[PDB]
């Protein structure tokens, strides 16, 4: 169960940075979640029903499908809000990235704490572009939407080339795999961090 | 065996829900379904996809009580009619079943869950094809037709591209769901 990593890059306006990230997070969390498990004393469990809803973008000419959980929506918009703040107060660099990590929880003997083994991680690298005129805005909307289409398609086409997923747990260890804190969904144990990057140069090799 | 009878249930209702997701994605407005922790015995694949009876009827008449198999694939054709009457095949969603089977699966519930994820991938992909941005601003009118093929895409014009929404292996063969759009 070694780690699987993937990278995405999108060039967006500063206004579009939140919508672009939410579209990537929600589509990945859509596939990386299930209905809430209700356990019986015997050990059987029933799986709840996951809802879906469309979200139309305001700063982008794009629409994406997210799970109807409102707690997950607010939770994601908060951390992407922290990203949107940090990048503005980082100024001229403007090169940031978020990472969505899906991890299992493994029990450790005393005194050690439980070790969180990652099994899949998603990195999205943001490139912010400054704008001037309005007719450049109305085109940036379209082209950014059409890029996000390619991105979502690629994500879906990856969610199949990845055969491995952690085994379904029993009633005791259900929190070693799933985030059972939301009342509307049961997503896999995930951790969302971000990082502002210093731009690096390009070597003169095959060029 | 009862196992493959349940498998036939899963393939059948997966096909019906496929038609539902596609046609509802070409319906011209946003779709919104609420989740439930106390679900009903009708929430197939743990997904709230409200069946609209007219398209279940059309889909069943197209299936004629059969399932996809080798050489027999289900297709959903999304087309456009304008004021002049020009008909264009915009999308052909194809639900293929190939020959390669896989015995390493307990068809019990792995196929069910992976088919659920395939329906989620279909939900996401149906909103990133250009015919979605077309069908939301609808002037224009969108038409659908389900048919059992024998799939062919000559009506798409030269230069079409295909997006693969995904595959799911079963002991009777692997399912493929893709789209050929203009």
UniProtKB/Swiss-Prot annotation, chain A:
Main location: cytoplasm
Keywords attached to this entry: Autophagy, Cytoplasm
Region (Important for interaction with ATG13): 152-156
GO CC terms: Atg1/ULK1 kinase complex; cytosol; endoplasmic reticulum membrane; phagophore assembly site
Gene Ontology molecular function: identical protein binding; protein kinase binding; protein-containing complex binding
Compartments it resides in: Cytoplasm; Preautophagosomal structure
GO biological process: autophagosome assembly; negative regulation of cell population proliferation; positive regulation of autophagy
Pfam families reported in the protein's UniProt record: ATG101
Outcome, altering residue 156 to D: Abolishes interaction with ATG13
Superkingdom assignment: Eukaryota
Reported function: Autophagy factor required for autophagosome formation. Stabilizes ATG13, protecting it from proteasomal degradation.
Quaternary structure note: Interacts with ATG13. Associates with a complex composed of ATG13, ULK1 and RB1CC1; the association with this complex requires the presence of ATG13.
Family: Belongs to the ATG101 family.
PANTHER family in UniProt: AUTOPHAGY-RELATED PROTEIN 101
Protein name: Autophagy-related protein 101
Swiss-Prot record, chain B:
Annotated localization: Cytoplasm, Cytosol; Preautophagosomal structure
Modification after translation: Phosphorylated by ULK1, ULK2 and mTOR. Phosphorylation status depends on nutrient-rich conditions; dephosphorylated during starvation or following treatment with rapamycin.
Consequence when changing residue 121 to H: Abolishes interaction with ATG101
Region of interest called Important for interaction with ATG101, as start-end residue ranges on this chain: 121-128
Domain notes: The LIR motif (LC3-interacting region) is required for the interaction with the ATG8 family proteins GABARAP, GABARAPL, GABARAPL2, and MAP1LC3A.
Family stated for the protein in its record: Belongs to the ATG13 family. Metazoan subfamily.
Job of this protein: Autophagy factor required for autophagosome formation and mitophagy. Target of the TOR kinase signaling pathway that regulates autophagy through the control of the phosphorylation status of ATG13 and ULK1, and the regulation of the ATG13-ULK1-RB1CC1 complex. Through its regulation of ULK1 activity, plays a role in the regulation of the kinase activity of mTORC1 and cell proliferation.
Oligomeric form and interacting partners: Part of a complex consisting of ATG13, ULK1 and RB1CC1. Interacts with ATG101. Interacts with ULK1 (via C-terminus); this interaction is increased in the absence of TMEM39A. Interacts with ULK2 (via C-terminus). Interacts (via the LIR motif) with GABARAP, GABARAPL, GABARAPL2. Interacts (via the LIR motif) with MAP1LC3A, MAP1LC3B and MAP1LC3C. Interacts with TAB2 and TAB3. Interacts with C9orf72. Interacts with RB1CC1; this interaction is increased in the absence of TMEM39A.
Record protein name field: Autophagy-related protein 13
Source organism of the structure: Homo sapiens
Positions spanned in the full protein: 7 to 190 of 517
């Amino acid at each position: 169960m070694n780690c699987r990593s993937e990278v995405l890059e999108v060039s967006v306006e500063g206004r579009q940075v939140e919508e672009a990230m939410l579209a990537v997070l929600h589509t990945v969390l859509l596939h990386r979640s299930t209905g809430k498990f209700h356990y019986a004393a015997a050990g059987t469990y029933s799986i709840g029903t996951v809802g879906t809803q469309d979200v139309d973008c305001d700063f982008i000419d794009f629409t994406y499908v997210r799970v109807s959980s409102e707690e997950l929506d607010r939770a994601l918009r908060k951390v992407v809000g922290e990203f949107k703040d940090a990048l503005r107060n980082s100024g001229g660099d403007g090169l940031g990235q978020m990472s969505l990590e899906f991890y299992q929880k493994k029990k450790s003997r005393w005194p050690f704490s439980d070790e969180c083994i990652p099994w899949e991680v998603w990195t999205v690298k943001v490139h912010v572009v400054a704008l001037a005129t309005e007719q450049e805005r109305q085109i940036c909307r379209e082209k950014v939407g059409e890029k996000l289409c390619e991105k979502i398609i690629n994500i879906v086409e990856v969610m199949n080339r990845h055969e491995y997923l952690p085994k379904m747990p029993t009633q005791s260890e259900v929190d070693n795999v799933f985030d059972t804190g939301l009342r509307d969904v049961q997503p896999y144990l995930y951790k969302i961090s971000f990082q502002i990057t210093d731009a690096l140069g390009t070597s003169v090799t095959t060029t | 065996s009862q196992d493959r009878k349940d498998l036939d249930k899963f393939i059948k209702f997966f096909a019906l829900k496929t038609v539902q997701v596609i046609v509802q994605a070409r319906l011209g407005e946003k779709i919104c379904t609420r989740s439930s922790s106390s679900p009903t015995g009708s929430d197939w694949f743990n997904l709230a996809i409200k069946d609209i009876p007219e398209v279940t009827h059309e889909a069943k008449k197209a299936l004629a009580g059969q399932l996809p198999a080798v050489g027999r694939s289900m297709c959903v054709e999304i087309s456009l009619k304008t004021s002049e009457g020009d008909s264009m095949e915009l999308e052909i969603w194809c639900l293929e079943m190939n020959e390669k089977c896989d015995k390493e699966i307990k068809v019990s519930y792995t196929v069910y869950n992976r088919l659920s994820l395939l329906l989620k991938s279909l939900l996401a992909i149906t909103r990133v094809t250009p015919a979605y941005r077309l069908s939301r601003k609808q002037e224009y009118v969108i038409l659908y037709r389900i048919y059992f093929g024998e799939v062919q895409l000559s009506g798409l014009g030269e230069g079409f591209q295909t997006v693969r929404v995904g595959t799911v292996g079963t002991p009777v063969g692997t399912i493929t769901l893709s789209c050929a759009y203009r």
